[model samples]
Structures are given as structure tokens and as C-alpha cells.
Target: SSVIARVALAHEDDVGKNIVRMDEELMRLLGVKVGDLVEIMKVSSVIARVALAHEDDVGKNIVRMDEELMRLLGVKVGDLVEIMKV
Candidate 1:
């Protein structure tokens, strides 16, 4: 199953690290726990090791990643992305 989340850029330092963050609310809505293998979809297919949001102001429907991750995932900022538990 998948959930739609607005794609947001992660911190610059995290670029190329395959780091992915998901809002806690959306994680719960998808029945996903702290960390799980997931598929983050865009033009470039990608898989990730899920990490729950640990930022100060992560929104309920937000998902974040760095530029390298977006390039690898084939997504861009503000795009509606479908994240599925793998």
C-alpha cells in the first residue's frame, strides 16, 4: 500500500546518502513503524530504508530527501509522491 506525500528537500548535508524521512502521522496512516524497507516512487524507481521524521517542523503529509536522492528517485520538490512499504 502507498500514501501520497508532498516531496520536500532534506538537509544539504544529507545529499547522496539515501536518507529518507517521513512525517510521523503519514507513517502511522500507512501502518508503518519506525523503520522499514520502502519504495519511494517517481520517474526513477527507488527503494529506501525508512526513517521516521526527526525534524523540528515536519508536516503531517510531508516526505523529505536530498537532491541526490531526488535525482536517483526521479522526483522533484513539491511533487506528490507515492510511498509504499516494500
Candidate 2:
């Protein structure tokens, strides 16, 4: 089954361009890891390289992406988006 992950609002000012971060639990659920490619489907589709983070504080459904990527998806904080292995 495909995962519909929630978007985590980024506070950084476009710090990492074209970067996506997933916590360990999320990666484990999706069977993906660092440097893995994934696809995000929102108002638009974004194919991004994955960056793994060991921050378990963040929930598994929350994905951290840059503002530019947010604009590309036309999504805001707390918005739900679809994600799957590429």
C-alpha cells in the first residue's frame, strides 16, 4: 500500500534545495533509506532524493522538505500528501 505522509512545516529559509528528509520510522515503514529516491504527489508531483534523519521526535507521517519544494507541491504545513518509493 502507498503511504500518504503528512508535510512537516519547515522553519529553515530554503536551507536545503531539492532535499527531502524522513525520520527513521518512516523510512523503516517505507523500506527506504538515505539517498533513496521517492515521489511526492500533492497539487503537483515532486521527485526528490531522500535524506535520512534519526530524529524520532518527529512522527513517521511527517516529511521535512524545503520551501521551494513546498511551493512546487502547493502544500502548506499540516497538509497531507502521498509518497511512495520511486
Candidate 3:
């Protein structure tokens, strides 16, 4: 395991199993959890904006996602991130 550690305080995906019944669509879109400690990737606003331009991204809810989710959705990160489950 990495030096960094986190616990499953919440999940943005995974149906009823989520702690707060988070939005599955948004979860599926990003597929990350609250406890997951992820590596960040710096990106320009333009790339972040393009993440929602996909066909499946019909709802604007994704726009409300955190900076990390936005970074992932934008695919601006050159490397993969790690997240832990409960």
C-alpha cells in the first residue's frame, strides 16, 4: 500500500452500497469514492470544459463535480490515480 491512506467515508458510485446514496450517474461518470486518495493532474480550464462535451454527458450535474473528478473527466491527467474501498 502507498504511504497515503484513506477510508471509505462516501462513494460517488456503486448503487445502494454507497453511504449517502450518491448520484450513480455521476459516480459512474467518474467512478471514484470519497475515501479514495487520488493523485492530481493539473489541467487547463478548456480541457476541463471538454470533459462534459461527450455524448453521454447530457446532464450538467457533472459540472458540479470536484476539481479532482473534473480532472479525471477531462482526461488531462497523464497518469492513473488510486482510490481505496471501504
Work out the TM-score per prediction. 0.81, 0.82, 0.22
lDDT of each: 0.77, 0.76, 0.30
Winner on TM-score between 1 and 3 is 1
Sorting all predicted structures by TM-score, with the top scorer first, yields 2, 1, 3
- Give the C-alpha lDDT of model 3: 0.30
lDDT: the better of candidates 2 and 3: 2
Give candidate 1 misplaced runs (Cα > 4 Å).
13-16, 55-60
lDDT string for model 1 (1-86, tens) is: 89988888886655436767887777878878866877888766788766767665355587888777788887788988888888
Clashes of each: 0, 0, 0
Instruction: Write down the TM-score for model 1.
Output: 0.81
lDDT of 3 by residue, 1-86 (tens): 21111111222442322122223354454555444322323232222111111234334332223334434435332323222222
